Design an enzyme around this catalytic site. Structure first.
Site, PDB file in Angstrom:
ATOM      1  N   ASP A  80     -14.803   7.878   9.970  1.00 24.09           N
ATOM      2  CA  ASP A  80     -13.640   7.987   9.100  1.00 24.09           C
ATOM      3  C   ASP A  80     -13.945   7.667   7.625  1.00 24.09           C
ATOM      4  OD1 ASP A  80     -11.010   8.780   8.860  1.00 24.09           O
ATOM      5  OD2 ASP A  80     -10.203   6.756   9.156  1.00 24.09           O
ATOM      6  N   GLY A 105       1.419   5.299   1.653  1.00 27.45           N
ATOM      7  CA  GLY A 105       1.260   5.977   2.925  1.00 27.45           C
ATOM      8  C   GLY A 105       1.883   5.081   3.972  1.00 27.45           C
ATOM      9  N   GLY A 118       0.814  -1.203   0.000  1.00 31.04           N
ATOM     10  CA  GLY A 118       0.000   0.000   0.000  1.00 31.04           C
ATOM     11  C   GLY A 118       0.848   1.253   0.000  1.00 31.04           C
TER      12      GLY A 118
HETATM   13  C1  LIG Z   1      -8.337  -5.049   6.500  1.00 30.99           C
HETATM   14  O1  LIG Z   1      -7.075  -4.702   6.278  1.00 30.99           O
HETATM   15  C2  LIG Z   1      -6.619  -4.524   4.943  1.00 30.99           C
HETATM   16  C3  LIG Z   1      -6.727  -5.738   4.120  1.00 30.99           C
HETATM   17  N1  LIG Z   1      -6.323  -5.710   2.836  1.00 30.99           N
HETATM   18  C4  LIG Z   1      -5.816  -4.527   2.300  1.00 30.99           C
HETATM   19  C5  LIG Z   1      -5.446  -4.534   0.880  1.00 30.99           C
HETATM   20  O2  LIG Z   1      -4.084  -4.450   0.664  1.00 30.99           O
HETATM   21  C6  LIG Z   1      -3.683  -4.010  -0.607  1.00 30.99           C
HETATM   22  C7  LIG Z   1      -2.463  -3.178  -0.723  1.00 30.99           C
HETATM   23  C8  LIG Z   1      -2.039  -2.709  -2.039  1.00 30.99           C
HETATM   24  C9  LIG Z   1      -2.892  -3.125  -3.156  1.00 30.99           C
HETATM   25  F1  LIG Z   1      -2.551  -2.731  -4.375  1.00 30.99           F
HETATM   26  C10 LIG Z   1      -4.091  -3.949  -3.014  1.00 30.99           C
HETATM   27  F2  LIG Z   1      -4.778  -4.244  -4.061  1.00 30.99           F
HETATM   28  C11 LIG Z   1      -4.508  -4.408  -1.750  1.00 30.99           C
HETATM   29  C12 LIG Z   1      -5.651  -3.295   2.985  1.00 30.99           C
HETATM   30  C13 LIG Z   1      -6.079  -3.286   4.390  1.00 30.99           C
HETATM   31  C14 LIG Z   1      -5.898  -2.018   5.177  1.00 30.99           C
HETATM   32  C15 LIG Z   1      -6.295  -1.849   6.499  1.00 30.99           C
HETATM   33  C16 LIG Z   1      -5.902  -0.538   6.774  1.00 30.99           C
HETATM   34  C17 LIG Z   1      -5.312  -0.026   5.628  1.00 30.99           C
HETATM   35  N2  LIG Z   1      -5.310  -0.933   4.646  1.00 30.99           N
HETATM   36  C18 LIG Z   1      -4.767   1.383   5.565  1.00 30.99           C
HETATM   37  C19 LIG Z   1      -5.381   2.153   6.729  1.00 30.99           C
HETATM   38  N3  LIG Z   1      -5.698   1.381   7.934  1.00 30.99           N
HETATM   39  C20 LIG Z   1      -6.060   0.158   7.953  1.00 30.99           C
HETATM   40  O3  LIG Z   1      -6.510  -0.337   8.978  1.00 30.99           O
END
Ligand SMILES: COc1cnc(COc2ccc(F)c(F)c2)cc1-c1cc2c([nH]1)CCNC2=O
Length: 302
Positions: free
Chosen positions: A130, A20, A18
Site C-alpha cells: 500500500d 478522508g 485527518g
Molecule cells: C498510526 O496511526 C496514525 C497516527 N497519527 C496520525 C496523524 O494524525 C494527524 C491528523 C491530521 C494532521 F494534520 C496531523 F498532522 C496528524 C495518523 C495515523 C493514521 C493511521 C491511518 C491513517 N492515519 C489513515 C489511513 N489508515 C491508517 O491506519
C-alpha cells in the site's frame, strides 16, 4: 449516561481528524498518562474487516524504528477500535505544503529511510502492498521522532512467507486490482501476486513523483476502474525509465533494478541504499533531517 466514548480503560475518544476517513480516525487521549494518541475505528458492522488483523500485523511488526506503537485494540460503542501512537502529517500533506515538489536532498533522506523501513517490514515476513505518500508520516513536534518517517496502515499487508511451511508464497496471477494505481508496480497492473520487489518499485514511483512533481500516467481516466488500471499500466510500460527518471541516473538504476527482480528474489537493500547514500555524499548533502518542510507551518491533529 456520560455521553463520552471511551476505548478500553483509559482512552477518551476525541474529534475525528485527518481528511478522508469519514469518522474512522480520531484524536484520543490517554487519561492515565495525559498523552494524546490516534484512534482508528471500524464499524463492527463492516463488510470488509481489516482492523483486527492490521492490529495483529502491528504486533508482528513488534516495536520497530519508524513503526507506530500500538496500545490497544477493543470494542468502542458499535466500533472496534485500535489505539496507537499519534504521529504528525503525511508526506502528501508535506508535499502540498512544499508546492508539490521535493528537493533531491529531501527525497534521498526519505528514500534512504523508507528502503530501511520496507526492509524491516520484509524482515518480519510481511509485504506492505500500500505504498503512497499518505501512508508515510513524520513524528510529532517534540516527541523526538518528528524527523523520523513512519509507515502506517497495514490493512493491505500480507505474509509472504508461509508461517508453517516457511516457504515464500507461490507465484500466481489473476489477483484483482484494488491498491492505488498511481504508484503500483507494473506487475501489479498485470494481476500478478505481489512480493517484496513490488513494495520497492512502488517506492521508486513515489520517489519520482516527489522529484518531478507528478507522474506521466497520473491524469488517466476511464469508464471502469479496470480500464483505468489498464491505461495507467500501459503508460507505465510505455514510458522508458530513462525518460521517467531523466536527470536522476540513480533513480533510473534503482527503478530498473527493482523492476527486474524475480518474484521470489530477496532485494539487495544494502545495494539500493548505497546507490542513494553515494549520490547523497557526492552532491555534498549532509543527512541532518532538514527536509524542505522544515521551518514551514505544519498541520496538526490537536
Ligand atoms: C498510526 O496511526 C496514525 C497516527 N497519527 C496520525 C496523524 O494524525 C494527524 C491528523 C491530521 C494532521 F494534520 C496531523 F498532522 C496528524 C495518523 C495515523 C493514521 C493511521 C491511518 C491513517 N492515519 C489513515 C489511513 N489508515 C491508517 O491506519
Amino acid at each position: 449516561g456520560s455521553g463520552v466514548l471511551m476505548v478500553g480503560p483509559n482512552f477518551r475518544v476525541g474529534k475525528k481528524i485527518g481528511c478522508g476517513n469519514f469518522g474512522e480516525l480520531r484524536l484520543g487521549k490517554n487519561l492515565y498518562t495525559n498523552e494524546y494518541v490516534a484512534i482508528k475505528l471500524e464499524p463492527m458492522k463492516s463488510r470488509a474487516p481489516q482492523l483486527h488483523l492490521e492490529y495483529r500485523f502491528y504486533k508482528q511488526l513488534g516495536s520497530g524504528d519508524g513503526i507506530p506503537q500500538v496500545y490497544y485494540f477493543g470494542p468502542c460503542g458499535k466500533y472496534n477500535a485500535m489505539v496507537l501512537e499519534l504521529l504528525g502529517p503525511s508526506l502528501e500533506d508535506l508535499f502540498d505544503l512544499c508546492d508539490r515538489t521535493f528537493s533531491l536532498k529531501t527525497v534521498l533522506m526519505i528514500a534512504i529511510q523508507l528502503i530501511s523501513r520496507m526492509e524491516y517490514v520484509h524482515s518480519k515476513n510481511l509485504i506492505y502492498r500500500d505504498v503512497k505518500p499518505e501512508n508515510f508520516l513524520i513524528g510529532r513536534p517534540g516527541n523526538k521522532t518528528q524527523q523520523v518517517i513512519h509507515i502506517i496502515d497495514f490493512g493491505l499487508a500480507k505474509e509472504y512467507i508461509d508461517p508453517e511451511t516457511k516457504k515464500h508464497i507461490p507465484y500466481r496471477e489473476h489477483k484483482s486490482l484494488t491498491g492505488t494505481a498511481r504508484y503500483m508496480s507494473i506487475n501489479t497492473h498485470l494481476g500478478k501476486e505481489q512480493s517484496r520487489r513490488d513494495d520497492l518499485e512502488a517506492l521508486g514511483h513515489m520517489f519520482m513523483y516527489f522529484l518531478r512533481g507528478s507522474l506521466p500516467w497520473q491524469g488517466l481516466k476511464a469508464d471502469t476502474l479496470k480500464e483505468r488500471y489498464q491505461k495507467i499500466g500501459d503508460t507505465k510500460r510505455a514510458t522508458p525509465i530513462e525518460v521517467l527518471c531523466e536527470n536522476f541516473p540513480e533513480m533510473a538504476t534503482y527503478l530498473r533494478y527493482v523492476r527486474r527482480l524475480d518474484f521470489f528474489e530477496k532485494p539487495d537493500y544494502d545495494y539500493l541504499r548505497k546507490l542513494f547514500t553515494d549520490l547523497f555524499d557526492r552532491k555534498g548533502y549532509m543527512f541532518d533531517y532538514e527536509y524542505d518542510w522544515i521551518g514551514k507551518q505544519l498541520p496538526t491533529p490537536v
